[PDB]
Design a binder for this molecule. Sequence first.
Ligand SMILES: [K+]
Ligand SMILES: [Zn+2]
Length: 414
Amino acid sequence: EFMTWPVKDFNYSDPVNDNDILYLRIPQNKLITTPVKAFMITQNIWVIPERFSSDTNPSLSKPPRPTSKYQSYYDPSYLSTDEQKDTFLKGIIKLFKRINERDIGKKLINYLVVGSPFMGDSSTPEDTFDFTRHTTNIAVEKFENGSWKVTNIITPSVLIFGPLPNILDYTASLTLQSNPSFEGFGTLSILKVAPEFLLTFSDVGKSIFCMDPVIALMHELTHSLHQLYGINIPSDKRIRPQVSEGFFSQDGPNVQFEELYTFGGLDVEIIPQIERSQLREKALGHYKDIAKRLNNINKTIPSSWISNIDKYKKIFSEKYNFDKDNTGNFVVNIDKFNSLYSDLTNVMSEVVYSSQYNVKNRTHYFSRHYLPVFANILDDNIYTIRDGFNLTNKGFNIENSGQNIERNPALQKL
Ligand SMILES: [K+]
Ligand SMILES: [Zn+2]
């Protein structure tokens, strides 16, 4: 047996309870300017069945610009009804239970739960925890006497929204001065996913397969992992996995370091070893910074929240895997740092998940896609927690044939 965080069942219609079903204000979502109903399916992991856009003038319609025939899909009405929001909630729940099917996923989920973003950033004085930042806090609101008001905060790890205007787009958000997600402190992670809408790839018409939505979700949660542990590499940093290649260069896509690390495998080595070593020693330096901070904290923001100091010294010293020295000071044990960093940036990667879950998956991050598909993953005759699409039905357990577009009538054209 291996330690497993429980995943709670919910109906969209279940009443708010001031515990794990709440109304939250999420200002980062420019498409919605009012509080929205949210469900804590596992500690610090909240599902928010709403569309998302951080665009200034947001619209869910197909824009008048280039879009991919294979990697984009638009439907402004999707996730507008309570039925669809129930379906979405139950879909994420089901995928989390499927994540828990392997110890690698159980460990991923634990890392997210215990990975709370730091109470502070580089502007924060060393002796101070700041409890007031939107990198850690989301507001809880209640509708009282005809209007909404803020009543409390939560400190989540991950918020799981429904999709962007492009329902197929799971890629890491462009960060994106002060960058806590790259400076050890970390930040809460906001995901935008759509588990019934699936990209396709070829294992080279008969060679075309759908991505298992648990793999897509886990890829996204691997981004969350990086963000929470403050090692998310800026979308700035890219490399062409080709390339030149000589006289008739040049480059295919410029792929983000963050994406290569999240996908994993041998393509990571496209990034020069010196740059990869520099990313690790950066993290190490930040983690050591945070150890020092825990040793020195004696005051808070707000000033009156001092009784939370000891609670959070324990939360963060556990998150970062610090030791004590003989003087009772937290220190970075380099071996424990190496193990955590290697888990975060190597063990937790898409190609490892594809192996561990007995699913077919794309060969490379930058592998091509084919026509996308749709599936009702809540029907256990189509998709189960134990087996995904690769059910014993019709022999779909053989050679991942459940994921094969031509073989499986349940994988519907979009
Ligand atoms: K089909
Ligand atoms: Zn990604």
